[PDB]
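Internal QA ticket QA-208
Title: Verify multi-chain structure generation after dependency bump
Assignee: T.L.

Test input:
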Amino acid sequence: MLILATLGSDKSVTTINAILTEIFTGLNPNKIIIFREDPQKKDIKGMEKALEYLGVNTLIEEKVIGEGIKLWREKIRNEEIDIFDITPGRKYMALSATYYSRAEEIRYVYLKDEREGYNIFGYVPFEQLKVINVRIGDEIPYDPPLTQNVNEAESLLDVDSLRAFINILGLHGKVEINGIDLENPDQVEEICLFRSGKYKYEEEKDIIKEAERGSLFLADTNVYIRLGNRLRSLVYNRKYGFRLLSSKNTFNELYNHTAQKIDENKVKFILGMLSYRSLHVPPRSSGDMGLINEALEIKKNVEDNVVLITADKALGLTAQSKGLRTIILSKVRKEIGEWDIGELLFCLSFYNDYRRMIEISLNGSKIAELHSYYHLQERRVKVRVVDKRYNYPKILEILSEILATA
Amino acid sequence: MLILATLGSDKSVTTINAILTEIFTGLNPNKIIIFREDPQKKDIKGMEKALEYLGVNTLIEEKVIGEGIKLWREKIRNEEIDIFDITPGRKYMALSATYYSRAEEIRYVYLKDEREGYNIFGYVPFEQLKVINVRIGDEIPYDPPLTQNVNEAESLLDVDSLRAFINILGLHGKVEINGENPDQVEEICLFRSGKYKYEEEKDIIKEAERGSLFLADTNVYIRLGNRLRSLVYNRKYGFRLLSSKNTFNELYNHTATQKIDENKVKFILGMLSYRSLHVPPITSQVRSSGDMGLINEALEIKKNVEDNVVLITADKALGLTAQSKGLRTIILSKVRKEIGEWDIGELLFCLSFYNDYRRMIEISLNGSKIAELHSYYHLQERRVKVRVVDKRYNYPKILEILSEILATADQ
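Actual output:
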């Protein structure tokens, strides 16, 4: 029998990803033990079934050890551990597994920077994380197991899972994305590039600088339809947080084009509405005097610095004429290096349906195809896998449910 | 020669606290080596002098090893370390220090709660953190070294350093503060310290979890103090307390005559919290424009944004009127006593300011006076001048150096 041990944490996603990295390096344990200091208090289900789809029939047992060091000296030797993974735990928990433990092998998966992780499995490229046997300091290679007992080709994935799907398929060989075309983009394709990050505005740097100074932001309708969920990364800072206010006028304009004929014009507003819903307004469709007026009203009533973000040059110039500090997205930059491929595919899938079945190909053979399916405030894409051996989105669906519950 | 080694981190405070914990457990190293994966890029000065004040004349050397496990495999064997501390590392550096290193003894500082750290040395009570010899797994006892070559008894400490001073003195023995029936100013001191809380503070936490905008009244800043940041801040949404113009106007009007009466003490105390909590972009205290009031500005923000606007006030008449206009108002009326843990530094700071404008509070160890403190305020500085009558326990002098380093690290 092969016994695998790992550590529990408050963010169980790290423990989940630690196990999956252990699975994807060839290990097929008969039993997996998660050592955690405190009771779980959050029933998590589906890992056994998800592991079944990956050709691993294992039992997952949670062993609550307790809080304290001497307590971990004694109770960590009780089990006959074969391979011990010590990545997602506490420092002292990881150290308490190297010492006083009968584990034959102890390994750790290292990530270049710790901050990119803590999300769904496969989002981080596998070139940036490598599992290391801490005893001898070598890199054990990957051999990703294929999916078994695959029932449904269709699956529901968010943006992160779609990017994870691309990265996981990269382990097997060359993964090409056919049908993208691009070349000479139209009006909708241009904003699709902006939302993905392939196109950026030179004034996006101004948003970062103003975010560092701790200033309120009000974003125009075109900002949500062109920057999308990238507004979260542009505005968020550790010191002050997410200081992007929810404009009523922007919501009103998005709502008017959302509630009814799905033309290319309507696609822009639906994309902005999904971003608007995701960014703020966590849970009032009344009239408003406009984006400029609401910035002026807040400016005279608070001591915070009010900044107005817009892609409408006429609106931005008028806002500056009233004294407001305005960031006007005018200059366009190409070749930014890094962008979210998942956001690009999400926009292009939606755009293609209202203009071409764009597919994901591996080694010159089509593997999966995707379409756009929207209902309420859900940024979900349905991908259908035509290859029964690579139906990883089914596992990603289970993981997404696990992460959402946590 | 005695050689001490530790690991470098992006937050150098963890490395600093690891060394000082090793100093306070009796270690007197002749040379201190900090192994880091990347270049420092932020010069730290004054640390050598702080170790001198504790009777340690040591050399502090930064040895950049590099990134990688195989790279750390070779370059960590160069030094003949005597004692290696592996608390402030990033696991793989700690493992690369446990393995492939000729350190005679390796120890690790354990903390009960992971988030209580990342602050000045001594802020966390020493009963919650213990240094452990990981080779055999026992607790290395404390023998706090005495201060040496201390020239000036008087020193300036902030709220965190004042708590650190009490906790550090706690290692030597029982530390009593020889300084009931509170008056109006003493009541708000209890509220700000955390000994007194309002039952409606739970509503602030719930609204913070719901992701709602906050506007706080003048009495909120003078009574809740800097705990308002903890009540509003949440990991998902952040610090969502807007800076009221009218509230600053009321505080500014009462801060600028000449005699500091009991009324002025409350407003300047609230002003200190107001500048510390928010208004980071706008600076100084000049030219605040007029406003129609806290209620009107809440209505104006409510009618222009889709966020949930919540008004915080201790004025029941104001809160009820705001509620009658539809605003979600949290009215601080009910008082909770015996809430468990409180900020001792804020308590002494609040009591020090009111006492200087109304006895003589002292800090005593085992029945013998150790230090006395007084109130000295200037702009956005919550500093208390404490004079130590025993040169053998002049720990605030070291705490001043640590506070400067922490301020330099976080611009």
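Spot checks passed. Chain A is about 35% helix and 20% strand.
Status: verified.
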